[PDB]
């Protein structure tokens, strides 16, 4: 028990620091004393850290920090710097974060190693599923290393069909070796035996299967394939004792069809079943959007009641940007956020998310795929530099609505009129309220 565990994320922030448990993503907000102490632990070990802050320990300031189960023994080498310079850099870092007024680094990194896909889902948010310039895993390894060192929480491997990416196995192995909490989302049709084996034995990587419904007819209409492959692979992961998740997009499923999926997830011990809002934000989707966010809540109520009334257990969730607009009873002007939560909740593109396309384009969100503005290259510039200076981030971060209703809304600071990308499409973005908003 000499240094911070690899299963724990610690980061300096403008207000002090943040602690996140990578197993359930529960956060702990730290003051400067706690943060600087743990910063020394991170770079010099507990003995040096405790010796340095002996006065603070004596005064009882670090009782909570010392009591937390976040310590371990690592093979990572300590900083060559003097602890005083490390503390010096910590103060400079905090002051810099105050000046820029940003979170230190995205928690969520989403990489698209190849935009190629073997399918053509009618609901796919991508414009095209072709790619002949995908980079090798070695180039992506440099990206992951930056992400880890700057305090990323999780990495999501998308596309495109990532299991059709030629260098997927090496990419997955790289994630495992770096001990990065990772997910990979796949249509599961032609996943390689080598890829399944890597996932089955993985500690840090969780597979997510894209499956709309057990109904063979309807799933073929939506994805162009039967559910057979997804079903079969979900069963396999259960039998080998590997956690596996399922994500469906709420396009035109009936309640009875969703419940069929719920029952399947229960019996095959799915770790998480998520139903996503059908997002048109990119502007490339084809299938007509039948349900809104209010309808998504309606489904959440129906499913949660079914699980309860049937006395079953399932980590069920509904997800989508601005989903909170369907919960008017929970919204009021007495809502108060911490410094972190105010920048974390709402639009993740502002201060917590980064997405990297196959060509290296750094987007605050996939929504910017339909925005005609220049994008910086991750294969030629450091992620951290971009996180600070990027004009797309700067635009969405500094955007403020002038809408009368929004200005009096309790969730104003985390929403600002709705999706920034949707708003800039309109004639007067600052006065337009996004139509997704059910309030």
């Amino acid at each position: 028990m000499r240094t911070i565990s690899e299963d724990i994320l610690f980061r300096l922030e403008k207000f002090g620091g943040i602690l996140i448990n990578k197993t359930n993503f529960e956060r702990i907000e730290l003051d400067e004393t706690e943060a600087f102490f743990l910063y020394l632990v991170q770079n010099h070990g507990i003995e040096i850290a405790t010796s340095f802050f002996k006065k603070e320990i004596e005064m009882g300031k670090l009782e909570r920090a010392l009591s937390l189960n976040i310590y371990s023994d690592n093979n990572i080498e300590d900083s060559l710097n003097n602890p005083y310079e490390t503390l010096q850099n910590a103060r400079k870092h905090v002051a810099k974060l105050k000046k820029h007024n940003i979170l230190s680094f995205p928690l969520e990194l989403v990489i698209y190693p190849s935009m190629y896909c073997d399918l053509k889902c009618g609901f796919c948010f991508l414009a095209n599923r072709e790619d002949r310039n995908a980079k090798p895993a070695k180039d992506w390894e440099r990206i992951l290393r930056q992400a880890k060192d700057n305090g990323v929480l999780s990495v999501s491997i998308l596309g495109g069909e990532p299991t059709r990416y030629f260098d997927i196995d090496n990419l997955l192995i790289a994630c495992e070796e770096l001990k990065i909490k990772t997910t990979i989302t796949t249509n599961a049709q032609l996943i390689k035996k080598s890829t399944v084996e890597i996932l089955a034995k993985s500690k840090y990587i969780t597979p997510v299967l894209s499956l709309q419904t057990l109904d063979s007819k309807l799933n073929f209409e939506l994805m162009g394939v039967r559910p057979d492959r997804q079903i079969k692979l979900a069963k396999y992961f259960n039998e080998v004792g590997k956690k596996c998740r399922i994500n469906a997009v709420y396009t035109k499923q009936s309640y009875e069809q969703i419940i069929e999926l719920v029952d399947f997830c229960i019996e095959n011990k799915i770790d998480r079943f998520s139903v996503a809002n059908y997002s048109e934000v990119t502007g490339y989707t084809k299938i007509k959007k039948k349900y809104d966010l209010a309808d998504l809540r309606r489904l959440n109520e129906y499913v949660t009641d079914y699980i309860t009334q049937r006395e079953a257990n399932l980590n069920f969730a509904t997800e989508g940007c601005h989903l909170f607009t369907a919960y008017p009873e929970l919204i009021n002007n007495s809502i108060e956020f911490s410094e972190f939560d105010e920048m974390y909740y709402g639009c993740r593109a502002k201060y917590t998310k980064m997405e990297i396309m196959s060509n290296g384009d750094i987007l605050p969100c996939i929504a910017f795929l339909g925005v005609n503005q220049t994008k910086q290259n991750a294969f030629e510039k450091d992620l951290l530099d971009v996180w600070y200076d990027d004009p797309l981030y700067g635009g969405i971060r500094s955007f403020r609505t002038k809408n009368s209703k929004c200005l009096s809304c309790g969730l104003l600071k985390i929403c600002e009129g709705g999706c920034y990308v949707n708003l800039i499409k309109e004639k007067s973005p600052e006065y337009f309220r996004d139509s997704v908003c059910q309030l």
Binding site: A276, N277, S279, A317, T318, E319, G320, C321, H322, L323, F324, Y327, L330, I335, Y345, G346, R348, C365, I366, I414
Partner: peptide, 13 residues
């Protein structure tokens, strides 16, 4: 607030 936090956590893609 626990209810509000769950909804806000889900308010994302």
């Amino acid at each position: 607030s626990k209810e509000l936090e769950k909804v806000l956590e889900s308010s994302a893609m």
